[PDB]
Structures are given as C-alpha cells and as structure tokens.
Amino acid sequence: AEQVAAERAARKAANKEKRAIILERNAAYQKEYETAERNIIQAKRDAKAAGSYYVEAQHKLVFVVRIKGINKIPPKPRKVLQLLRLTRINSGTFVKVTKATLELLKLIEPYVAYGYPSYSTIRQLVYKRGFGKINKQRVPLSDNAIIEANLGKYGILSIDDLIHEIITVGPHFKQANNFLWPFKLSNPSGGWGVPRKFKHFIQGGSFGNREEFINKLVKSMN
Amino acid sequence: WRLVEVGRVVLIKKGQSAGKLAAIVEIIDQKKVLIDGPKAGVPRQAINLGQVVLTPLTFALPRGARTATVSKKWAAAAVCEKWAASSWAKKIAQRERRAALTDFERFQVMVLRKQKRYTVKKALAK
C-alpha cells in the first residue's frame, strides 16, 4: 500500500516543523538568559559607579538534598521530607522559595543541605538524571515528544522548555516539578571535604544553606 | 655557616617555582621570610624556611627593595654566573641531562664509558 511512505513523510514533516519550533524557542531562551545576566551586571556596575549599594533580588529558586539517613529521624522532619519527596538519602528536588517553604527547610535543615542552583547545574541535572513521572511510572527524558505529550497543554514541548520553566519558576512550576521524578544523586566525587558531615556549613560542617556552593556540591554529587 | 639575611640567594625546593633561584628581601618572622626572583620569573611572595634551602652565595640588596630594584641588583651582582660554577648547580644540570638521556644516547654513553675504562685501566699500574 501507499501508507508506508505517506505516513513516514507526514510524520517526518511534522517532526521537522516541531524541531524548528523548538530551535527558535531555545534560541529565544538563550538570548533572554544572556540579556538578563548582562542587565544584572550592568545594574551592579551602575550601582557601584553611582556610590550607592545594590538591591539584589531575592532568590526565587532553591534546591534541597537529603544528607542524613532514615534512622533516628524525628517524626516531624521525616514527615516534612516525605511530603518534600526527599525519601531516600542523596535525593533532592526543586522547591519554590516562600515563607511557607523557608519555615519548612528550617525544620529539616539539620538533616538536609540546600542552596541556590544555576542554569548550568539545572541543565546538567535535567539532561543526565532527569526522569519524568508518567502514569505513575518512572520514564527517563530522552525524546522531546515524551515531554510534549505530558506537558503539551502547558506549552512545554522540549527538555529546554522544562529547564526554562524550572529555572524561571514560571506559572507552571508546580506541574514541572511534579512531573520530574526525585533526582537520584551519588555521593560527591571528591567527598564532603569537612571531616564531620553532621555539622552546620557555616561552622565547617555540611548541612545548611550554602547558596552558590550548592552548585559545586551537586556537580560533584552528579 | 649559611645565615639568613637581606640579599641572601636561595633555592626553592617545592612549588611551581621549585628549582628556581630567589633572594631574601625582608625577614617577616623566625619561620617566614619575603623572597623575590624577577630573573627566574617567580612572583614576589612570602615563603616559609621549610620550603626553601639557603645557598652559600650572597649579594648586597637594599632592605625592602622593590621588584625593579631587586632585578637591577641581581643583574649587577651576576650571581647567576657564580651559581652555575658551583658544584651544586653542576650536579643539578648533570642529573637533568642524565634523566633526559635517550636509549640510543644511553647506549652511546655505555660505549664511551667502556672506551674510557679501557684507557683508565691501562693507565694504572704503569
């Protein structure tokens, strides 16, 4: 029959059109990121030159990783971790920054480490350990069609779209975070560094808010 | 008896500047001193005595001399020529060359050693 070639040609044309759409979207996202970083740097330069202090915006995205085992965990932190999908050790997920969540991290802070990720780390995680949740099953993200089918209605049709939504904390942050399976992370390649892991980071420990150092820690744990 | 003093030339034992020559410009304390070596390219920085070995050579240097003054005094003193004539520098160069010898170069060295040994043995007793 003539279907064998006709269907192949039609699907190839549709895939080519979708590829061009994704390419233009990715180019726009990259241009937006570059412009935002350049504008931030220019604003800092202007503040420094004008003899006035800078008013950096609050960190709207944080990442939390489980650092302690299940044993002897008090019930409240254990429930917090369970509701945060931080069940097994060395696992983490992105969470929106709010007082409702900051006060939650305050309780699990002794048993978790968190900070402010970056575009490079988020992209690396999504590309390597990025696993999607479909029909309650764990499906690795390897094709743009897989993500598009589950989040097409939300305007997400590629891995780059998912990364852009996650980093920008856009309107569909809830759905993007839920679709992503909790990240399975190995122990750091270079080790935790400090001789005693179970201590506050600000006093030579590990657990606690470390801001940019979380990006370095994740890459070693990736 | 080698003594630490301003203008004393030293050899760095470990670090990116290991194997290069520097001079003590100003002593900081019992264990740390300030050294420089513009000719060798080592940046002006402080170093501990444990990481540096004092050479027997010495030259006059103004206290707290800057990089330009240190370089000018080093060039004027020509301490580099004295260092090369020292047996220590000769041994260092010999070790470097010997480690850099190729297999064919080593075979030629063995042949020359046998040739020299023949004559040396013939020279004995006589």
Binding site: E211, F213 | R2, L3, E5, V6, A46, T67
Partner: protein, 163 residues
C-alpha cells in the same frame, strides 16, 4: 585561608558597618548577623544585608607590623586583648592570630571577635618584644639542625643536619 569582607546592615538608616573575616561570604554574613545582636537589638528577618564586598590588600608586597585588637570569650567571660603581629597582609595576620589563640588560649573562630587592625609605621611603637626584636637593622641568624625529607627508606651516608 581566611578572606576579608565588608558587610553593612540597616534593618530595612544608620547603616551599621563593620569588617568581617571569613573563609566565604556565607560565613561572613552569619558572623555579621551574630555581631548585630551583640552591638544592638536586631534580627535576621528585620531587614537585609545592604551590601557585601570582599576587600583585597592594597599591596600584598610590603611587610607591615599590624596592630590588632581582639576580644575573645574565654571559659570565664570575655576579656579585651591587644596584640601586634608582623606580617604582609591583614588576611594572613588575622589567620596567624587565630592560630596562636587556638594554640594557647584554645580560642577559635566561634569565640573570637576582631575589633580593629592597623599598621604601625614607626619603630618603638610596638610594645611587644617578640615583634620588637625584628624591627632592628638588617640582622643575620642561622638555622641550626636542619633536616631533609628522605624519600628513600634507606640511607647509606649517615645524613648530617648542617645548614
């Protein structure tokens, strides 16, 4: 390896300013917040850190007899202490003071407060003999009983400690 940072705050004004020495900006912010409670009554949620910037030595190529005023919380209260240290930079001078305190008084980063650091450009101003001895004219002294790290397990020459 410490680092010098300038941290200011105003509880969202007077713009309280002080110098904080820490290995990273995160520790510097925590130390600034802790010192805020001692200086006055302020909380972290009250405002925000207006600006934090690392301060580099103007010229890390000159030996300076740093005069440092340090207050530490000993096992029986806190006492004001003053010391002079000969070094090339403030970052190294404060680290040396911290190490000396930990070696003797066993005071560490947790219970040490840095008040002021200032250079001394005139002789006879340093009242500490251990620094005063190094302020004389170009001197010379030996390094007896020097040793060498013998990588080889065995030695055949009976090494000597001469320098």
């Amino acid at each position: 390896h410490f680092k010098e940072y300038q941290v200011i705050g105003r509880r969202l004004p007077k713009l309280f300013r002080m110098r904080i020495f820490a290995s990273n900006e995160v520790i510097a912010k925590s130390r600034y917040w802790y010192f805020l409670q001692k200086l006055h009554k302020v909380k972290k949620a009250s405002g925000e850190i207006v600006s934090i910037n690392q301060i580099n030595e103007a010229h890390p190529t000159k030996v300076k007899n740093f005069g440092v005023w340090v207050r530490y919380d000993s096992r029986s209260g806190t006492h004001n202490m003053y010391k002079e240290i000969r070094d090339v930079s403030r970052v190294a001078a404060v680290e040396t003071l911290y190490q000396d305190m930990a070696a003797r008084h066993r005071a560490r980063f947790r219970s040490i407060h840095i008040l002021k650091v200032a250079e001394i450009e005139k002789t006879a101003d340093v009242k500490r003999q251990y620094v005063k001895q190094f302020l004389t004219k170009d001197l010379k002294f030996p390094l007896p009983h020097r040793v060498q790290k013998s990588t080889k397990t065995f030695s055949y020459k009976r090494p000597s400690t001469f320098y």
